[PDB]
Design a protein around this motif. Structure first.
Motif, PDB file in Angstrom:
ATOM      1  N   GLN A  44      -3.582  -4.946  -8.854  1.00 49.97           N
ATOM      2  CA  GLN A  44      -2.708  -3.829  -9.171  1.00 49.97           C
ATOM      3  C   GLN A  44      -1.939  -3.439  -7.920  1.00 49.97           C
ATOM      4  N   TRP A  45      -0.644  -3.201  -8.078  1.00 48.47           N
ATOM      5  CA  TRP A  45       0.235  -2.894  -6.964  1.00 48.47           C
ATOM      6  C   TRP A  45       0.485  -1.397  -6.895  1.00 48.47           C
ATOM      7  N   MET A  46       0.880  -0.934  -5.715  1.00 50.13           N
ATOM      8  CA  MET A  46       1.172   0.470  -5.482  1.00 50.13           C
ATOM      9  C   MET A  46       2.203   0.569  -4.371  1.00 50.13           C
ATOM     10  N   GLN A  47       3.215   1.403  -4.578  1.00 49.45           N
ATOM     11  CA  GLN A  47       4.240   1.667  -3.577  1.00 49.45           C
ATOM     12  C   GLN A  47       4.039   3.071  -3.029  1.00 49.45           C
ATOM     13  N   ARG A  48       3.962   3.186  -1.706  1.00 47.40           N
ATOM     14  CA  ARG A  48       3.756   4.465  -1.032  1.00 47.40           C
ATOM     15  C   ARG A  48       2.514   5.191  -1.535  1.00 47.40           C
ATOM     16  N   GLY A  49       1.561   4.465  -2.113  1.00 49.59           N
ATOM     17  CA  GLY A  49       0.351   5.066  -2.629  1.00 49.59           C
ATOM     18  C   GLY A  49       0.409   5.510  -4.074  1.00 49.59           C
TER      19      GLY A  49
ATOM     20  N   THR B  32       1.293  -1.495  -1.255  1.00 48.66           N
ATOM     21  CA  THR B  32      -0.089  -1.933  -1.130  1.00 48.66           C
ATOM     22  C   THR B  32      -0.442  -2.856  -2.295  1.00 48.66           C
ATOM     23  N   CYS B  33      -1.685  -3.338  -2.304  1.00 47.31           N
ATOM     24  CA  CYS B  33      -2.146  -4.264  -3.340  1.00 47.31           C
ATOM     25  C   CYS B  33      -3.649  -4.077  -3.508  1.00 47.31           C
ATOM     26  N   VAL B  34      -4.053  -3.252  -4.467  1.00 50.35           N
ATOM     27  CA  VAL B  34      -5.476  -3.042  -4.707  1.00 50.35           C
ATOM     28  C   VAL B  34      -6.004  -4.190  -5.554  1.00 50.35           C
ATOM     29  N   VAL B  35      -7.018  -4.882  -5.042  1.00 49.79           N
ATOM     30  CA  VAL B  35      -7.605  -6.042  -5.699  1.00 49.79           C
ATOM     31  C   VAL B  35      -8.990  -5.649  -6.184  1.00 49.79           C
ATOM     32  N   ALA B  36      -9.187  -5.670  -7.496  1.00 45.25           N
ATOM     33  CA  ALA B  36     -10.456  -5.296  -8.102  1.00 45.25           C
ATOM     34  C   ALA B  36     -11.255  -6.549  -8.421  1.00 45.25           C
ATOM     35  N   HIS B  37     -12.513  -6.572  -7.989  1.00 51.69           N
ATOM     36  CA  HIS B  37     -13.384  -7.709  -8.241  1.00 51.69           C
ATOM     37  C   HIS B  37     -14.833  -7.253  -8.158  1.00 51.69           C
ATOM     38  N   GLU B  38     -15.724  -8.020  -8.790  1.00 54.95           N
ATOM     39  CA  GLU B  38     -17.142  -7.682  -8.754  1.00 54.95           C
ATOM     40  C   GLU B  38     -17.728  -7.889  -7.364  1.00 54.95           C
TER      41      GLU B  38
ATOM     42  N   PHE C 134      11.827   7.664  -6.865  1.00 51.27           N
ATOM     43  CA  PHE C 134      10.404   7.876  -6.660  1.00 51.27           C
ATOM     44  C   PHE C 134       9.640   6.640  -7.136  1.00 51.27           C
ATOM     45  N   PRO C 135       8.619   6.173  -6.391  1.00 44.42           N
ATOM     46  CA  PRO C 135       7.988   6.712  -5.177  1.00 44.42           C
ATOM     47  C   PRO C 135       8.782   6.547  -3.882  1.00 44.42           C
ATOM     48  N   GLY C 136      10.006   6.034  -3.949  1.00 43.46           N
ATOM     49  CA  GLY C 136      10.827   5.955  -2.757  1.00 43.46           C
ATOM     50  C   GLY C 136      11.153   7.334  -2.213  1.00 43.46           C
TER      51      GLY C 136
END
Ligand SMILES: *[C@@H]1O[C@H](CO)[C@@H](O)[C@H](O)[C@H]1NC(C)=O
Ligand SMILES: *[C@@H]1O[C@H](CO)[C@@H](O)[C@H](O)[C@H]1NC(C)=O
Ligand SMILES: *[C@@H]1O[C@H](CO)[C@@H](O)[C@H](O)[C@H]1NC(C)=O
Lengths: 224, 166, 224, 224
Positions: free
Chosen positions: A143-148, A191-197, B15-17
């Motif tokens: 899952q990706w995230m920009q600026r949190g 960012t790039c949150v990687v979910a795994h066991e 946003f989020p920019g």
């Protein structure tokens, strides 16, 4: 005359924070008033099914039955039976699913490769790729995230896990985020949150500004 | 549909920019236009040139050898994409203007972008930006091989493009 | 028993430099007198199948036919039919093979991303990733050549094509080559070769080594 | 009357993607009703030939016969015989052409020499030259792609292959592409693709950019 019991993929557990059991039938002769039930090892009925589909026009039933179970119960790895009550079958058709055993857990390695310099020259788009390698089993959820803040699933896609060329027992998944070149050339995190066991906390993340590769000790600039 | 125009950031990244605000260019070009007091809006600097102009390695017009019909299609696609991107920019409430049921000021923005396109093809731009000058010269070359009459003929179709986008 | 179609793909014809039509009759019992022939609509085609596959663990053969056809003839869009005549089949069945049509061609944009800095710091391995983006139709063949010489298929694995995140009709594929940090630090240029229909030359090659990212004009080095 | 059939040059093979042939002929009687035909040792059906040249006033009539031949069949070197029949000469003009064998395949080395600074200083032109040296088969096809889009043959002129001075077996060729110095300074990465048999994939690229060839002018050694 079998039943397709879909286990909840780890992406499903991580997305909704609950274990969802969905068993789908197939190749069953057409008749109404057909019921399904979910039963665990002891055979006790677990949860009544919802969102039942109408009779399948294709002559092969596909009815979706949702049953909720305790997360720890699924993590233990018991065999959960989906009993299908069909009029033609003298006894209900039963299909059960248990998570694979063994499957030596290996923590994923999450490396983000920023866009190639020859792609930013196009000044149209860029693809930040969050390479994930050296993990088992073959179930991740990038899952990706920009600026949190999360980004809509439209912007990024995750390639299916495949065997790693080096380590036989490990897999690698490869996800990309289509970013606009202006938003990259301007400092943005992505960012790039990687979910795994196998992960300790079950999620890890790595960020890539425009300045990650920069020396951070000499802002050497070229000007005419 | 896809043309290579990214989401508008002229008045601030969506946003989020956070940053990316484009300031008014209150400057004039000596070669083109000489003295002109007009200030280029941030939106015009960020006009979705689309396929008419590619920024690869500086600036190179993409219509060096393009037919009149092809140019009309390119401009129609550019206007449609401009309308779409302006709608998604103002709907999220990122445009300073936007901070019926349409987003506040979206119709103003799309009408003004259409005016900017009209003056880009006509070649009567108040101030020539980097993309404005070469595109104006090339569009003058393509039609005259009279530009005002052409646009006075295809303006209905170009505005139909905005209506279809909406 | 049932006849299935296996049209050649660009991965196959380009690797072998020849159009190999393949027939498939899935899970047919171990019987004798397997006959396969190939015919177009006109029907003058006659190719002989060679090296039929041996019995699988299910103890049932899967008919496979090898045919040689000119690239132009296959590219003409003409539907290719394979005759199937075998004892288990009550009557001969003909399977129809043809390529999909009405799909636009867009040239890929092979972007070669060097391995992440974090991965080299581990001093374990490096995975040079070849990003083949913006291409269509979804059939791409990626070859890895080091110092102008092909690399073994074991070293690299190519991700299956997936729909592009944003662009509707375009796709994207990734090919990762795993090599030791010492080799990467030395620098052998690890050229990535991509073969696709839409490429004007039908093949495009890209190059990467340790020195691609480093700036050329200034060599600012911090010392202690 | 003897037909000077020409084999399909590798440039024709790669530019048109098809094997096109002709049966040019030195002729005595200017015109005759019957037209060209092509025969093979296998005796397969002749291909359709159309658009025959009009009568040549100087009695040296030359006729063209177009045929489609499989690349693999021509690759094998099997001899193809042009059969031309005319009213004046009842005997067919049986002449055979095959690609010469017995010549070792040598991989071309492609080196893209940037423009001389004596030329860029004039700021009027920039003749990029693709120096193709070391290929043993005489055939070669050099094509120029600027900024990822192939360029028309008008812009660039490819010198005919000639024997190499030092190595007698090997050959060399040139292909100069001239672009205004305005385009060169933008750094458009003018790429040269050479098509030759000996190459691993029949095409190799070499890209020259305004930055390439620039040494490290500034070598700042910050030491604390
Ligand atoms: C120097 O620092 C400034 C910070 O304002 C940054 O914008 C600039 O890019 C840096 N120099 C280089 C060459 O990146
Ligand atoms: C560039 O800097 C590195 C850093 O030590 C150095 O090893 C290298 O020799 C430099 N390049 C040249 C051409 O000297
Ligand atoms: C560049 O500077 C470094 C600093 O130690 C030096 O080692 C190297 O030899 C220099 N290279 C050139 C080409 O001047």
């Amino acid at each position: 005359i079998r039943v397709f019991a879909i286990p909840p993929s780890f992406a499903s557990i991580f997305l909704t924070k609950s274990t969802k059991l969905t068993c789908l039938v197939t190749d069953l002769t057409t008749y109404d008033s057909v019921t399904i039930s979910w039963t665990r090892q002891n055979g006790e009925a677990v949860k009544t099914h919802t969102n039942i589909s109408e009779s399948h026009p294709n002559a092969t039933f596909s009815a979706v039955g949702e049953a909720s179970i305790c997360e720890d119960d699924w993590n233990s790895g018991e065999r959960f039976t989906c009993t299908v009550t069909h009029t033609d079958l003298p006894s209900p058709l039963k299909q059960t699913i248990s998570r694979p055993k063994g499957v030596a857990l290996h923590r994923p390695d999450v490396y983000l490769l920023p866009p190639a310099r020859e792609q930013l020259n196009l000044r149209e788009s860029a693809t930040i790729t969050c390479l994930v390698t050296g993990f088992s089993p073959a179930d991740v959820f990038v899952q990706w995230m920009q600026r949190g803040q999360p980004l809509s699933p439209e912007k990024y896609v995750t390639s299916a896990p495949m065997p790693e060329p080096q380590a036989p027992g490990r897999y690698f998944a490869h996800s990309i985020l289509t970013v606009s070149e202006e938003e990259w050339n301007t400092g943005e995190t992505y960012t790039c949150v990687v979910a795994h066991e196998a992960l300790p906390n079950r999620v890890t993340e790595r960020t890539v500004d425009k300045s990650t590769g920069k020396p951070t000790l000499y802002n050497v600039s070229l000007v005419m | 549909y896809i043309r290579g125009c990214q989401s508008k950031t002229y008045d601030g990244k969506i946003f989020p920019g956070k940053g990316g605000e484009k300031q008014w260019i209150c400057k004039d070009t000596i070669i083109h236009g000489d003295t002109n007091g007009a200030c280029i809006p941030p939106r015009t600097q960020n006009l979705c040139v689309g396929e008419l102009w590619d920024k690869s390695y500086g600036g190179r017009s993409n219509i060096k050898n393009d037919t009149k019909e092809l140019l009309k299609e390119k401009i129609k696609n550019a206007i449609h994409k401009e309308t779409e991107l302006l709608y998604e920019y103002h709907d999220t409430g990122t445009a300073i203007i936007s901070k019926n049921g349409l987003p506040k000021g979206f119709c103003h923005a799309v009408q003004r972008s259409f005016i900017d396109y009209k003056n880009m093809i006509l070649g009567t731009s108040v101030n020539i930006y980097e993309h404005i000058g070469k595109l104006q010269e090339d569009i003058k070359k393509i039609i005259e091989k009279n530009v005002n009459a052409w646009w006075k003929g295809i303006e209905r179709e170009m505005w139909d493009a905005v209506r279809c986008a909406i």
